[PDB]
Write an enzyme that holds these catalytic residues in place. Structure first.
Site, PDB file in Angstrom:
ATOM      1  N   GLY A   1      -8.364  -6.281 -40.978  1.00 56.20           N
ATOM      2  CA  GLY A   1      -6.687  -5.896 -41.417  1.00 56.20           C
ATOM      3  C   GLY A   1      -5.661  -6.485 -40.770  1.00 56.20           C
ATOM      4  O   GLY A   1      -4.489  -6.253 -41.085  1.00 56.20           O
TER       5      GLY A   1
ATOM      6  N   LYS B   1      -5.625 -12.239 -42.951  1.00 54.02           N
ATOM      7  CA  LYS B   1      -4.425 -12.953 -43.426  1.00 54.02           C
ATOM      8  C   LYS B   1      -4.572 -14.502 -43.425  1.00 54.02           C
ATOM      9  O   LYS B   1      -3.728 -15.054 -44.066  1.00 54.02           O
ATOM     10  CB  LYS B   1      -3.291 -12.464 -42.353  1.00 54.02           C
ATOM     11  CG  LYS B   1      -3.222 -11.228 -42.057  1.00 54.02           C
ATOM     12  CD  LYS B   1      -2.479 -10.326 -42.943  1.00 54.02           C
ATOM     13  CE  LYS B   1      -2.589  -8.904 -42.679  1.00 54.02           C
ATOM     14  NZ  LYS B   1      -1.997  -8.079 -43.800  1.00 54.02           N
TER      15      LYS B   1
ATOM     16  N   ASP C   1       0.702  -4.166 -50.631  1.00 54.54           N
ATOM     17  CA  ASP C   1       1.945  -5.252 -50.497  1.00 54.54           C
ATOM     18  C   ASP C   1       2.641  -5.524 -51.822  1.00 54.54           C
ATOM     19  O   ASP C   1       3.276  -6.518 -51.871  1.00 54.54           O
ATOM     20  CB  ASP C   1       1.580  -6.410 -49.776  1.00 54.54           C
ATOM     21  CG  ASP C   1       0.252  -6.988 -50.441  1.00 54.54           C
ATOM     22  OD1 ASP C   1      -0.115  -7.941 -49.933  1.00 54.54           O
ATOM     23  OD2 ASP C   1      -0.193  -6.831 -51.469  1.00 54.54           O
TER      24      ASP C   1
ATOM     25  N   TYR D   1      -0.785   4.979 -48.908  1.00 50.50           N
ATOM     26  CA  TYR D   1      -2.083   5.167 -48.196  1.00 50.50           C
ATOM     27  C   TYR D   1      -2.054   5.714 -46.991  1.00 50.50           C
ATOM     28  O   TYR D   1      -3.094   5.775 -46.236  1.00 50.50           O
ATOM     29  CB  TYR D   1      -2.716   3.669 -47.930  1.00 50.50           C
ATOM     30  CG  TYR D   1      -1.696   2.833 -47.369  1.00 50.50           C
ATOM     31  CD1 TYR D   1      -1.067   1.628 -47.996  1.00 50.50           C
ATOM     32  CD2 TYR D   1      -1.662   3.056 -46.031  1.00 50.50           C
ATOM     33  CE1 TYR D   1      -0.130   0.808 -47.106  1.00 50.50           C
ATOM     34  CE2 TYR D   1      -0.916   1.869 -45.008  1.00 50.50           C
ATOM     35  CZ  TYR D   1      -0.246   0.837 -45.789  1.00 50.50           C
ATOM     36  OH  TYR D   1       0.490   0.207 -44.773  1.00 50.50           O
TER      37      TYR D   1
ATOM     38  N   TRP E   1      -9.339   4.161 -43.480  1.00 54.70           N
ATOM     39  CA  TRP E   1      -9.020   2.881 -42.848  1.00 54.70           C
ATOM     40  C   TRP E   1      -8.154   3.424 -41.412  1.00 54.70           C
ATOM     41  O   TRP E   1      -7.167   3.808 -41.540  1.00 54.70           O
ATOM     42  CB  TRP E   1      -7.969   1.983 -43.613  1.00 54.70           C
ATOM     43  CG  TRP E   1      -7.303   0.914 -43.017  1.00 54.70           C
ATOM     44  CD1 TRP E   1      -6.581   0.901 -41.813  1.00 54.70           C
ATOM     45  CD2 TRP E   1      -7.147  -0.327 -43.763  1.00 54.70           C
ATOM     46  NE1 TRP E   1      -6.330  -0.417 -41.726  1.00 54.70           N
ATOM     47  CE2 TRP E   1      -6.392  -1.154 -42.908  1.00 54.70           C
ATOM     48  CE3 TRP E   1      -7.532  -0.666 -44.928  1.00 54.70           C
ATOM     49  CZ2 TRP E   1      -5.932  -2.379 -43.189  1.00 54.70           C
ATOM     50  CZ3 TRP E   1      -7.165  -2.391 -45.270  1.00 54.70           C
ATOM     51  CH2 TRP E   1      -6.355  -2.926 -44.548  1.00 54.70           C
TER      52      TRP E   1
ATOM     53  N   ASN F   1      -6.302   2.728 -38.069  1.00 50.83           N
ATOM     54  CA  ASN F   1      -5.504   1.530 -37.538  1.00 50.83           C
ATOM     55  C   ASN F   1      -5.778   1.668 -35.871  1.00 50.83           C
ATOM     56  O   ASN F   1      -4.557   2.193 -35.138  1.00 50.83           O
ATOM     57  CB  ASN F   1      -4.369   1.396 -37.928  1.00 50.83           C
ATOM     58  CG  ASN F   1      -4.112   0.916 -39.184  1.00 50.83           C
ATOM     59  OD1 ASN F   1      -4.774  -0.264 -39.312  1.00 50.83           O
ATOM     60  ND2 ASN F   1      -3.330   1.255 -39.972  1.00 50.83           N
TER      61      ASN F   1
ATOM     62  N   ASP G   1      -1.523  -5.097 -33.274  1.00 54.84           N
ATOM     63  CA  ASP G   1      -0.744  -6.111 -34.040  1.00 54.84           C
ATOM     64  C   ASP G   1       0.716  -5.705 -33.836  1.00 54.84           C
ATOM     65  O   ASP G   1       1.580  -6.735 -34.013  1.00 54.84           O
ATOM     66  CB  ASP G   1      -1.165  -6.868 -35.180  1.00 54.84           C
ATOM     67  CG  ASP G   1      -1.230  -5.645 -36.340  1.00 54.84           C
ATOM     68  OD1 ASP G   1      -0.529  -4.251 -36.057  1.00 54.84           O
ATOM     69  OD2 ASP G   1      -1.763  -5.659 -37.375  1.00 54.84           O
TER      70      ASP G   1
END
Ligand SMILES: CN(NO)C(=O)N[C@@H]1[C@@H](O)[C@H](O)[C@@H](CO)O[C@H]1O
EC number: 3.2.1.169
Length: 584
Positions: A147, A178, A258, A295, A354, A356, A361
């Site tokens: 991701g 992406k 998104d 989320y 999920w 991170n 990034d």
């Protein structure tokens, strides 16, 4: 004799003997009834470790028996004697090594494959300990979400990652990068033949490693919901999903993260109508996965209650659908049990995580090289699906991913320091101790605003530095601590130089700048001690020469792209420069 480093930590392990040597030619039994992917992984290791398979039984060779429960193999029954996989959960297995025999029995084909992975870790120079194992994961889905923003992983990177997942018992890979338009900006369009080979290799590798290849779809960019347009777009979702199913995809995720159209009911109706017309109708498609527009807890909840979107979404989305969330923040220190309790209660189901970290990034100068940290060791009560978002840096992501494998397979016994050490031991070999010196300074992520996670950099060194300031401000003799710290700083530099000289290129290319940074910082740290020592000796000339160096070394570090040890090696120079020993 002794048991090697194992990952994941098996659920039950008993050392029941002194160990023995595996013969260079062995008896293979069960090879036709047992899971093919497990057998292939076995054949692959045997080949690599210079072990041949007897074409006919026993010049008293070692005997290796492999298969699943209810498989018609009496040899397996006999070698296991007393221990069994019959009462174990999905993906579980039993392993027994004893007196010239190794028995591998899985509850299913996945379990058999995982038994082969433990086997491969148990063998060292053709010696294996005598053990009884019964093993199975804490959490049902464990793995990676691709991701992150930034330079994509290459095809070879992904193939390598998939193999690595298999070897550490990670069974989930969410393909949603992406750089593949067919997952977002060209979401309606089936893959053209010019792309089918690349996609198939990934799918094939995944299957072969017991990894669930989840196709991530993000239709948010331009999906239409109402009237004829919305119908056409829903039909495109089907045709896309079918065309991927035709390639052998059996897992799907639909992202709403998104989308501008923040319409919970529209999102969840698309999910439910997909679940029914696709997931249910195919019958061998795994539960649907989604990411809702809200989320993380901060986006999802206000004053203990769901916000409008989340409340509508929770109320509409089928109970069979996996729902991902990232914890209390998008990037946060922790997921405490109370956060997972709260979100799980809102959705009335076990949640998907999920996570991170190690993703970098949002703060790319720094490498995130620490363990799973901050995750409640009881999360499995409210969570049955765990993934991490890794770095664009595929190779160095293995350190942290390795620890996620332990955390999600054996959650109750997870110990982040021990897992962090083990990951680096198992990954770096003879460079492990040097890699620990370096990685230890690069575990904490913090962009200074919204994103913070990970174990503090170099805690022990940081505590020693604190004691230095305490001693010096108390006018206590600091001579021995100063000598000790000179040792630490020389060690950082030496370790980093050995990593520059000896790290394989696949790793070095990801960290060369950060290695050079830590060296710069270690030299500034050393010069900072020289400054203090000069002040203790009232040598104004030695003070000025050490101060010039400390300041230039700090300034090189501050101006560089690379970021490391901000609160430790870097901050120490700033602390030393602001310290005035002449007034104590
Ligand atoms: C769950 N999710 N979107 O599906 C997500 O975490 N997205 C991004 C995630 O892709 C990104 O790596 C991270 C750090 O910059 O920020 C998040 O907002």
């Amino acid at each position: 004799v002794l048991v090697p480093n194992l990952n994941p930590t098996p659920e039950n392990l008993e050392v029941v003997g002194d160990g023995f040597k595996i013969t260079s030619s062995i008896n293979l039994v069960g090879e036709e009834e047992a899971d093919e992917n497990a057998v292939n992984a076995l054949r692959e290791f045997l080949t690599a470790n210079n072990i041949e398979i007897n074409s006919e039984n026993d010049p008293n060779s070692t005997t290796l028996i492999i298969g699943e429960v209810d498989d018609d193999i009496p040899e397996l029954d006999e070698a296991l004697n007393g221990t069994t996989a019959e009462n174990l959960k999905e993906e579980g297995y039993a392993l027994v090594s004893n007196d010239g025999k190794i028995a591998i029995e899985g509850k299913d084909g996945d379990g058999t494959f995982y038994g082969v992975q433990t086997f491969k870790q148990l063998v060292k120079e053709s010696n294996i300990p005598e053990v009884n194992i019964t093993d199975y994961p804490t959490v049902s889905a464990r793995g990676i979400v691709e991701g992150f923003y930034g330079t994509p992983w290459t095809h070879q990177d992904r193939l390598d990652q998939i193999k690595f997942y298999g070897e550490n018992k990670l069974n989930t890979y969410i393909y949603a990068p992406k750089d593949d338009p067919y997952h977002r900006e060209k979401w309606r369009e089936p893959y053209p033949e010019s792309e089918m080979q690349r996609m198939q290799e990934l799918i094939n590798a995944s299957a072969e490693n017991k990894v669930d290849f989840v196709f991530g779809i993000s239709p948010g960019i331009d999906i239409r919901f109402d009237g004829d347009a919305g119908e056409e777009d829903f039909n495109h979702l089907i045709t896309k999903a079918e065309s991927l199913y035709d390639m052998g995809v059996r897992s799907f995720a639909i992202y709403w993260d998104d989308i501008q159209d923040k319409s919970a009911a529209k999102h969840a109706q698309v999910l439910n109508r997909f679940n029914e017309e696709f997931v249910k109708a195919k019958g061998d498609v795994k539960p649907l996965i989604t990411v809702p527009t809200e989320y993380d807890t901060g986006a999802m909840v206000s004053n203990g209650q769901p916000r409008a979107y989340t409340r509508i979404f929770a109320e509409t989305v089928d109970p069979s659908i996996e729902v991902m969330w990232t914890g209390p923040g998008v990037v946060t220190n922790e997921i405490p049990l109370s956060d997972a309790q709260l979100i799980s209660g809102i959705y009335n189901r076990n949640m998907a995580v999920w996570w991170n970290y190690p993703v970098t990034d949002y703060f790319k100068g720094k490498l995130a090289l620490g363990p799973m940290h901050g995750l409640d060791k009881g999360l499995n009560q409210y969570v049955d699906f765990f993934t991490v978002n890794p770095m664009e840096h595929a190779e160095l992501s293995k350190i942290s991913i390795h620890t996620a494998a332990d955390y999600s397979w054996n959650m109750d016994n997870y110990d982040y320091d021990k897992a962090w050490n083990r990951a680096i031991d198992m990954l770096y070999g003879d460079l492990a101790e040097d890699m620990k010196v370096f990685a230890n300074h690069s575990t904490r992520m913090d962009n200074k605003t919204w994103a913070k996670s990970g174990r503090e950099d170099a805690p022990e060194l940081r505590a020693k530095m604190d004691e230095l300031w305490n001693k010096l401000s108390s006018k206590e003799d600091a001579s021995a601590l100063i000598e000790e710290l000179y040792g630490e700083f020389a060690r950082m530099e030496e370790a980093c130089n050995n990593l520059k000289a000896n790290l394989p290129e696949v790793a070095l290319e990801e960290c060369s700048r950060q290695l050079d940074e830590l060296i710069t910082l270690a030299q500034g740290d050393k010069a900072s001690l020289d400054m203090i020592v000069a002040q203790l000796n009232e040598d104004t000339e030695a003070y000025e020469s050490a101060k010039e160096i400390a300041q230039n070394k700090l300034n090189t570090a501050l101006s560089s792209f690379a970021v490391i040890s901000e609160k430790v090696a870097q901050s120490f120079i700033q602390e030393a420069l602001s310290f005035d020993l002449t007034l104590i």
